[PDB]
C-alpha cells in the first residue's frame, strides 16, 4: 500500500504515467480505438493480446511485468442514463479489485465515459464520484489523467474539498 494513500489529477497523456500500472478506457472488443484507448495501443500493443471484456468490467493483461487494467465503460449513446449509470459504477468497482489483487501502490486511471462514450453530454462528476465510490476503499496512490485546462481544475477542486 501506498504510506498515505491519495487522489492527485495531471493533464497530459496517461501514456507518459509515472505509476506502476495504467487503466485503459477500452471497448469491448480490444480493438486500437481512439483518445485514450489508441495512445495506449501505441504504448503497450502487446497489451491487446486477448483483452476483449463486456461492458462493466476489467480485464487486465501484462506488458512485460506492467499492468494494463483495460475497463470497459458504457458508450452513454447506446444505453439508457439509468443502465449505463450502472455499467459506469460497475467497471470501477472491477478497477478496484484488479488494481488490490496486483499489489500496486499507484495507478493512472482516466474518467471512463467521459469522451466519446459521453453521449454527447458533460460527464466529469458522475464518472469522478463512481471513480472515488470505488477507490477510496483502496489504498493505492490514484493519478487521474485529463486532457482539458477547466476539467483538471474541476477535478482538483473534487479531490482537495474532501480535504
Ligand atoms: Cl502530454
Ligand atoms: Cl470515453
Ligand atoms: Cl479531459
Same mark, same amino acid.
Request: with cysteine; aromatic share 8%; net charge neutral.
Given at each position: 500500500?501506498?504510506?498515505?494513500?491519495?487522489?492527485?489529477?495531471?493533464?497530459?497523456?496517461?501514456?507518459?504515467?509515472?505509476?506502476?500500472?495504467?487503466?485503459?478506457?477500452?471497448?469491448?472488443?480490444?480493438?486500437?480505438?481512439?483518445?485514450?484507448?489508441?495512445?495506449?495501443?501505441?504504448?503497450?500493443?502487446? *497489451?491487446?493480446?486477448? &483483452?476483449?471484456?463486456?461492458?462493466?468490467?476489467?480485464?487486465?493483461?501484462?506488458?512485460?511485468?506492467?499492468?494494463?487494467?483495460?475497463?470497459?465503460?458504457?458508450?452513454?449513446?447506446?444505453?439508457?442514463? *439509468?443502465?449505463?449509470?450502472?455499467?459506469?459504477?460497475?467497471?470501477?468497482?472491477?478497477?478496484?479489485?484488479?488494481?488490490?489483487?496486483?499489489?500496486?501502490? &499507484?495507478?493512472?486511471?482516466?474518467?471512463? &465515459?467521459?469522451?466519446?462514450?459521453?453521449?454527447?453530454?458533460?460527464?466529469?462528476?458522475? &464518472?469522478?464520484?463512481?471513480?472515488?465510490?470505488?477507490?477510496? *476503499?483502496?489504498?493505492?496512490?490514484?493519478?487521474?489523467?485529463?486532457?482539458?485546462?477547466?476539467?483538471?481544475?474541476?477535478? *482538483?477542486?473534487?479531490?482537495?474539498?474532501?480535504?
Amino acid at each position: 500500500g501506498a504510506m498515505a494513500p491519495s487522489y492527485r489529477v495531471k493533464r497530459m497523456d496517461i501514456a507518459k504515467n509515472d505509476e506502476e500500472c495504467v487503466v485503459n478506457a477500452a471497448n469491448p472488443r480490444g480493438l486500437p480505438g481512439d483518445g485514450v484507448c489508441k495512445a495506449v495501443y501505441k504504448k503497450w500493443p502487446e *497489451s491487446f493480446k486477448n &483483452s476483449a471484456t463486456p461492458v462493466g468490467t476489467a480485464k487486465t493483461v501484462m506488458c512485460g511485468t506492467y499492468p494494463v487494467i483495460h475497463a470497459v465503460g458504457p458508450n452513454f449513446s447506446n444505453y439508457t442514463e *439509468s443502465e449505463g449509470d450502472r455499467e459506469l459504477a460497475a467497471a470501477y468497482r472491477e478497477v478496484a479489485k484488479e488494481v488490490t489483487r496486483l499489489g500496486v501502490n &499507484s495507478v493512472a486511471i482516466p474518467l471512463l &465515459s467521459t469522451g466519446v462514450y459521453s453521449g454527447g453530454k458533460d460527464r466529469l462528476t458522475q &464518472s469522478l464520484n463512481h471513480l472515488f465510490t470505488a477507490m477510496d *476503499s483502496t489504498d493505492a496512490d490514484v493519478v487521474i489523467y485529463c486532457r482539458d485546462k477547466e476539467w483538471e481544475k474541476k477535478i *482538483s477542486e473534487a479531490i482537495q474539498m474532501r480535504t
